[PDB]
């Protein structure tokens, strides 16, 4: 049960840690497209998708793991019109790390913290 | 242990995901929607939709060497809580049919789901 | 080891699910809504609702021989983000009171929750 803390993901606002490392398994919090330095949210969905993804990556790498060890994601979205765009980014993100795609759920919710267009949580394994 | 689960008995991974992953001790499925594995059709009735997602979950869990009775956790994202009595009747019947202990569950009403399905079901199965 | 968890300190199961599953290394809870185990009722105020879901989670985790400080991941499903600051405050004091480090967390606003409660909270806890 080790806590994960990285400056390459946005710092914890409220009463949660960025990640927890259980030994075999790493769980991230839901990541939103907040810039870890500036605290800013990009306006385009394609930039939001990339930034949530990077924020997930940061926590997983801080645990000593890679993109390729992510086995499950959930993508919470606010607008299905954004779906093909989010998918393209999500695909390029995995391809660039030469990593097979995780398992995945994807649901459109009513609203997300800070009115972002998406939120991504992950589960990675050590081997 | 990481092994990708791939089956013709569940609908083909359309976008950037795999249907299931087998970690040895645990199996995770992608969220299963009511898409017919052979025809790509979405049944119109919520009873048939409920039944079809559960069957798709089954197909992936079985392709891993497991069964429905190994399912320990499900999340059931739905678009109408008024459908809930019917979903729940189908869902009870499914575990019963398979002589399976009921898993833990969360059920929430979301805004909308891929391909305008009424439910999406993700599952976690353990080996022993 | 697939042990069903059963406690009277959380509302009894109302359908095809169990309150919790103990796998040995981890414990998964069903999604907990703010129904009082003794009255079957829902308090109107969201601080009360948040506290109660959290107590209900704790009742199951504790039935497995674990404690609040062993909870590693929560998903908080809410129907109104305007409730969020209030829910956080209650959620934080809950963990502080138990001297527990905060779990990882996802928080989304859904459209509707069973019995029209304001939030629903599921958990995962680990033994070691």
Numbering used by the authors:
A (entry chain C): 2 to 128
B (entry chain A), C (entry chain B): 1 to 128
Q: Can you quote the paper on this entry?
A:
The sixth gene of the tdc operon encodes a protein, TdcF, that is a member of the YjgF/YER057c/UK114 family. The location of this gene within the tdc operon is strongly suggestive of a role in the degradation of 2-ketobutyrate. Each 14 kDa subunit comprises a single domain that contains a predominantly anti-parallel, six-stranded β-sheet against which are packed two short α-helices. The most significant structural features are the three symmetry-related solvent-accessible clefts, located at the interfaces between pair of subunits, close to the "equator" of the trimer.
The first crystal structure of TdcF was determined at 2.35 Å resolution by molecular replacement using the structure of the paralogue YjgF as a template. The original 2.35 Å resolution as-isolated X-ray data set was collected at 100 K using a cryoprotectant solution containing 20% (v/v) ethylene glycol. During model building and refinement, it became apparent that whilst the electron density in site A was consistent with ordered water molecules, a more substantial region of elongated density was present in both sites B and C. This could be modelled convincingly as a single ethylene glycol molecule in each of the two sites making a single hydrogen bonding interaction with the side chain of Arg-105. It was noted that the central part of the loop connecting β1 and β2, which delineates one side of the cleft and bears the conserved residue Tyr-17, had elevated temperature factors, with Ile-14 being poorly defined in the electron density maps. Since ethylene glycol makes only a single hydrogen bond with TdcF, it is likely that it binds with low affinity, and it is only seen in the structure because of its high concentration in the cryoprotectant. In our initial structure of TdcF, the cryoprotectant ethylene glycol was shown to occupy two of the three binding sites, but this is unlikely to be physiologically relevant.
